[PDB]
């Protein structure tokens, strides 16, 4: 019939995946460790800022609803199933988020909660089109991630950094991501093949071209103009198609979502909204 929930086992990371039960005592941390989202034993779901409570989930939160919980046997739990839900029998309530209008049932599988470095909690419909480093965790919401927008050329020799990690279209023609310890976490394997150009194209395909526009390697992610290329500080490299569907601040259901930008017009992995 449907998806059932499993227990959450990612305490201290920045993301609560779909259909995972966060129980009392468990918490998320923003990638910069400044913010913590904590389900307390008293049934309050709380965000702390360097250890000081600055938000509590209740009826006062815009775009949320509180309804009766009749089931006495329902454990204290917080989980995401497109919308987020807090089951709190101690106060006879289910506190839940009023997300923006759903577009397909597949969103139920793709939508997870992110605790961002700016303290916002955001529900994000997230699809990893390509993951170059499946062994390295995806870490959304980090100010130190490097994001490349579609239409971004990787200039040969330029070192694009995300913390201590880097992505480089090298002199030898290889396209390589290096992790924080200096070792390569991923490479296209295009060294010594005559590579002249590496580009994250407007169609969302990452492509390394040789002489005569010959294709040497590509991510097979063409046809996704809203995708971004992300290099994380932990060495992860991936191409993701993502959109937020709720947040505790900034979000309005009728507003346009957009990523915040650096003073040099480069996007960062933090969602914001406007008209
Ligand atoms: O795998 C990343 C690595 O790829 C290429 O190096 C390969 C080979 O040519 C090297 O000699 C050996 C050891 O030095 O490692 C690889 O198998 C290079 O493009 C290199 O810069 C890159 O880090």
Residue numbers in the entry: 2 to 276
Article sentences:
Putidacin A (or LlpABW), first identified in Pseudomonas putida BW11M1, represents a class of Pseudomonas-specific antibacterial proteins not related to any known bacteriocin. For the protein containing two similarly folded domains, we constructed site-specific mutants affected in carbohydrate binding and domain chimers from LlpA homologues to show that mannose-specific sugar binding mediated by one domain is required for activity and that the other domain determines target strain specificity. The LlpA branch occupies a unique position among MMBL-domain proteins, harboring non-eukaryotic representatives and being equipped with the capacity to kill bacterial cells with bacteriocin-like specificity, a property not yet demonstrated for other family members.
Soaks with oligomannoses revealed additional sugar-binding subsites. Binding site IIIC accommodates the disaccharide Manα(1–2)Man and the pentasaccharide GlcNAcβ(1–2)Manα(1–3)[GlcNAcβ(1–2)Manα(1–6)]Man. Although mannose-containing carbohydrates can bind to the IIIC pocket of LlpABW, it remains unclear if these are part of or mimic the natural ligand required for biological activity since bacteriocin activity is not impaired in the presence of excess mannose.
